[PDB]
Amino acid sequence: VEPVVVIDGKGHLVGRLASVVAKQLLNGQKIVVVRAEELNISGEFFRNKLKYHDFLRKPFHFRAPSRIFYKALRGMVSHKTARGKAALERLKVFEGIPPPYDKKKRVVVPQALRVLRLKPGRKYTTLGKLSTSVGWKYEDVVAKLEAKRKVSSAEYYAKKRAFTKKVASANATAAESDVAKQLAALGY
Amino acid sequence: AESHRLYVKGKHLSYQRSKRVNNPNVSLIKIEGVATPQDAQFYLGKRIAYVYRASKEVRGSKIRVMWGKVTRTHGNSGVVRATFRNNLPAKTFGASVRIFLYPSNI
Amino acid sequence: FALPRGARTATVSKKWAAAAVCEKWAASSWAKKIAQRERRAALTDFERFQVMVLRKQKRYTVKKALAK
Amino acid sequence: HFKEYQVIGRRLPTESVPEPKLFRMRIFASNEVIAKSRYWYFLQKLHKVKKASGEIVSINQINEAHPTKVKNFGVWVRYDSRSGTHNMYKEIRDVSRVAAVETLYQDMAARHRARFRSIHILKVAEIEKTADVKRQYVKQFLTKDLKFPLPHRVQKSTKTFSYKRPSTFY
Amino acid sequence: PKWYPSEDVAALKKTRKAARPQKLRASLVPGTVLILLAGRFRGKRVVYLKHLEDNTLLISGPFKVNGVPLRRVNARYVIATSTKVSVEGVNVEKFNVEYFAKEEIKAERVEDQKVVDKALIAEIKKTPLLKQYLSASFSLKNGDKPHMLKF
Amino acid sequence: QANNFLWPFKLSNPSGGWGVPRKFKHFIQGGSFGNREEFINKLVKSMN
Amino acid sequence: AYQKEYETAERNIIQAKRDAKAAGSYYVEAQHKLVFVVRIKGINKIPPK
RNA sequence: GGAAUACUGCCAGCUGGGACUGAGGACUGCGACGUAAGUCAAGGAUGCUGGCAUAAUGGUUAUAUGCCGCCCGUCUUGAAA
RNA sequence: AAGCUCGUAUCAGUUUUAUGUAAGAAUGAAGAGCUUUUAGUGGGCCAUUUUUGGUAAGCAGAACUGGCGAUGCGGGAUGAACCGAACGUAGAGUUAAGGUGCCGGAAUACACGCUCAAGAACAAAAUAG
RNA sequence: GCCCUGGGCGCUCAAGCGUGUUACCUAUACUCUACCGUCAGGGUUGAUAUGAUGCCCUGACGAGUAGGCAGG
């Protein structure tokens, strides 16, 4: 339905998000993933640092959270095939929200959120912490310039809220009229 | 008018197939806004067309079209099986297809 | 609304009538949204065209109320 | 779903033994055939009578008198486990006997990994007076003006993409 | 006719298939507004005038409102709306299957179209927005569900 | 004589399936074979 | 005649059951004398007998 | 006290939507409609419409796409080897 | 393969009753017998279960019926000892084992509890009643 | 009873475990239809509106090493 979909990785499970993205873009849907560093994995820090060195001690290994997510997505797609290679060309993963994706709406997957999937009172791991612990050196800059992203975007939202205030006032003053009642009668 | 569309958009997923055996004669088509067999029941019998651009000139256009028909529902997520006079090239997996409204029953 | 534990059908209906539950439900925005969704689902094509025309007319004045 | 079936038999009355004991028991099953099979199995296990030496006099479904009244039922459960057999007693709060026995079977299959074959329902007795219930988890739902919340609801979304970032509030 | 068969091709058997009149769906009623799904006038809104003996439907735009003239159309390529005009005032007896035989437009056809339009416009204008509604071409929009839309 | 005159019935698979996940078990224990006195009619109608 | 016989037989069976219930006794239904059999397994690996 | 409803089964009850199939080749027969003439869904598709001779369509081959396919014959042996 | 008779009362890897072979018993084929001769066949692998019996052990020795010999096809990551099912060329339809987060076609189905760690015969002996 | 001690990608109100109720995918498996052949039966002329060595109707069947038979 959407020519390009931007998915906010924060608060989502790596496995569920990877599976849903693989299924979606295997059907030709273009998907973009942002804020991968904020992606979460179930379980406390231990047993999440583990199971990574286990396969590491075997090739080339990538420490960036985006590369980890791609590897998770890569194994869920029939790579080495033209369809698999073509499907993987419709995927983009970045840390934070670099432009121009910062100026566009970002969606989430209800069936992949940690809150809706993980039972309360259970420890969970975050991709950023694991990446830093396994040698990632860009967490500091990622956080620093993500905080700046919220800066002045709060101001943009405030301006939008102010504009919508005037829009609502204009609607209300024109409301209750004959045309307004006619529209409300037809569910609009 | 802004939009000239008179058909429901859909995506071609893959042919009906087993683990190691596939049946190209029967294609699976996903219909936008359809997620249950009951909803897909309305689309049964409707003509489905696939539109793609060609490199060489044709009999009065530059677009070539492959027509098909809906046969039966598939799965539980609203997937529907479609049949065409000429089977799809298997390269359209994930491509966009046009599900027309005729023949109508309303 | 108030209701004794284990109230039978007659008592439940009596309490429902006394508490004006139906009146409260209609006032809630949730019931209004449900009714609006049902009306939109039941909208006819000609009704949809009328809605479009009325929306255009209303916007013609809404856009003039602002900017001045 | 399950149903309650009353089954009787008098071991094929013969000469010198007219009008036998006419064994009676209330079997629980999903159909008449299963009820008859379980009745035969119980008769063989607990009595000196076999299927080939018996006759089902009658079988009629018994529905709960008040399928709307909330009641508490005491069950004297007897079942076979990995070692010998152990009698068990449990209290289940349910509107109807069928639901109570179904929940008991589910609990046995969950907390004991026992199945219908090894589970015998000796007797189910209704309890209505307070202070007669013994299990704490059943007394938990007998306090006056009991009210509890349902935090962290998990309402499902049909569409795979949501722009609302849904909240779990209730 | 008179030539003896120079090669004895076997004759066909007595086929037991008697022709029967088309049983149109109840939704199709005269005076109903129709939406064309294909053809030259695809997407146009049309008025249902009369049923023809060749399983086609005699329809009119009317021609004056949207330019669609009197033409034959198949019921399977048409969606019947719930809005119906009083077509009783339009004389449709003249139109028949042989009328549309294709053997610069014939003058008689233009006269018949004008006569039909004159009668139909009076009823069309009898209700608000009917002229504008018929002048608007129907089209789908994002999020539209034809299996849910109540036509 | 009547039974032998009729050719053995050639029945198709049930329209709604066999229901139970595994057919090769006694009907009294959630299977598909055995004594299904009352349900035999439904099984035949589904297969027919 | 066959339809009448079937209707009378079913009505008589139901009436007898109801009378037995009312009379405080037990009615032993006549044992079924006809059973249909359907093959559920394939030809392969079927034991000889 | 009485309605129902819940559930099982019956309808030689009614009414649609979707997919494949058109096999036989002048009448012999079993049936229905109708007082009769005649008709019929009754031992296998009938009628209409739409495109066509710088045709319509079909065919050969290179690549490509979704899936499958251990290198051929012989002998060892109960087997793969 | 060929000749006679008979389609008849001729049989059965089926069942039950009687004698501790009979049935004017059930079911299916009526397609069987009587003589002459004519290719190939005397390779076996494994579960049981007869048993000879067991102490570092092992199975030495066997043996009773069965799966395969020459056997495709679907599932089991692959497999000869597993499950279904055995084969003319295609269409429609319904299923088996096996599955339904992706690879892979299908419910991130419904309901009850269990477990933070894997979990999806051998190092075994120490949350409800 | 369970948890730690004695196919890959992946998952934890599981996408793990036991049981319970429904929706669906398919094999050469089964129902019907379309066609090739084998078998069995039957129809056939005071001659056939195509070789009685012809033209047909009906039902089932169709795996396979050595070996046997038949048609090209």
Swiss-Prot record, chain A:
One of its GO terms (cellular component) is cytosolic large ribosomal subunit. One of its GO terms (molecular function) is structural constituent of ribosome. It holds the Pfam family Ribosomal_L13. InterPro entries: Ribosomal_uL13 (IPR005822), Ribosomal_uL13_CS (IPR023563), Ribosomal_uL13_euk/arc (IPR005755), Ribosomal_uL13_sf (IPR036899). There is a cross-link at K166 (Glycyl lysine isopeptide (Lys-Gly) (interchain with G-Cter in ubiquitin)). Component of the ribosome, a large ribonucleoprotein complex responsible for the synthesis of proteins in the cell. The small ribosomal subunit (SSU) binds messenger RNAs (mRNAs) and translates the encoded message by selecting cognate aminoacyl-transfer RNA (tRNA) molecules. The large subunit (LSU) contains the ribosomal catalytic site termed the peptidyl transferase center (PTC), which catalyzes the formation of peptide bonds, thereby polymerizing the amino acids delivered by tRNAs into a polypeptide chain. It comes from Saccharomyces cerevisiae (strain ATCC 204508 / S288c) (Baker's yeast). Its main location: cytoplasm. GO terms for biological process: cytoplasmic translation; maturation of LSU-rRNA; negative regulation of translation. Present with 43300 molecules/cell in log phase SD medium. NCBIfam families: L13_A_E (TIGR01077). This is Large ribosomal subunit protein uL13A. It comes from the Eukaryota. Keywords: Acetylation, Cytoplasm, Isopeptide bond, Ribonucleoprotein, Ribosomal protein, Ubl conjugation. Belongs to the universal ribosomal protein uL13 family.
Swiss-Prot record, chain B:
It comes from the Eukaryota. InterPro entries: Ribosomal_eL33 (IPR001780), Ribosomal_eL33_CS (IPR018266), Ribosomal_eL33_sf (IPR038661), Transl_B-barrel_sf (IPR009000). The keyword Ubl conjugation applies. The modification N-acetylalanine is found at A1. This is Large ribosomal subunit protein eL33A. Component of the ribosome, a large ribonucleoprotein complex responsible for the synthesis of proteins in the cell. The small ribosomal subunit (SSU) binds messenger RNAs (mRNAs) and translates the encoded message by selecting cognate aminoacyl-transfer RNA (tRNA) molecules. The large subunit (LSU) contains the ribosomal catalytic site termed the peptidyl transferase center (PTC), which catalyzes the formation of peptide bonds, thereby polymerizing the amino acids delivered by tRNAs into a polypeptide chain. SUPFAM superfamilies: Translation proteins.
From Swiss-Prot, chain C:
N-terminally acetylated by acetyltransferase NatA. It is found in: Cytoplasm. It comes from the Eukaryota. Present with 45300 molecules/cell in log phase SD medium. There are 2 genes for eL14 in yeast. Component of the ribosome, a large ribonucleoprotein complex responsible for the synthesis of proteins in the cell. The small ribosomal subunit (SSU) binds messenger RNAs (mRNAs) and translates the encoded message by selecting cognate aminoacyl-transfer RNA (tRNA) molecules. The large subunit (LSU) contains the ribosomal catalytic site termed the peptidyl transferase center (PTC), which catalyzes the formation of peptide bonds, thereby polymerizing the amino acids delivered by tRNAs into a polypeptide chain. Belongs to the eukaryotic ribosomal protein eL14 family. Component of the large ribosomal subunit (LSU). Mature yeast ribosomes consist of a small (40S) and a large (60S) subunit. The 40S small subunit contains 1 molecule of ribosomal RNA (18S rRNA) and 33 different proteins (encoded by 57 genes). The large 60S subunit contains 3 rRNA molecules (25S, 5.8S and 5S rRNA) and 46 different proteins (encoded by 81 genes). This is Large ribosomal subunit protein eL14A. It comes from Saccharomyces cerevisiae (strain ATCC 204508 / S288c) (Baker's yeast). The gene is RPL14A.
From Swiss-Prot, chain F:
Present with 101000 molecules/cell in log phase SD medium. There are 2 genes for uL30 in yeast. Component of the large ribosomal subunit (LSU). Mature yeast ribosomes consist of a small (40S) and a large (60S) subunit. The 40S small subunit contains 1 molecule of ribosomal RNA (18S rRNA) and 33 different proteins (encoded by 57 genes). The large 60S subunit contains 3 rRNA molecules (25S, 5.8S and 5S rRNA) and 46 different proteins (encoded by 81 genes). Component of the ribosome, a large ribonucleoprotein complex responsible for the synthesis of proteins in the cell. The small ribosomal subunit (SSU) binds messenger RNAs (mRNAs) and translates the encoded message by selecting cognate aminoacyl-transfer RNA (tRNA) molecules. The large subunit (LSU) contains the ribosomal catalytic site termed the peptidyl transferase center (PTC), which catalyzes the formation of peptide bonds, thereby polymerizing the amino acids delivered by tRNAs into a polypeptide chain. It is found in: Cytoplasm. Coiled coil: none annotated. This is Large ribosomal subunit protein uL30A. It comes from the Eukaryota. The chain holds residues 197 to 244 of 244 of the full protein. The gene is RPL7A. Belongs to the universal ribosomal protein uL30 family.
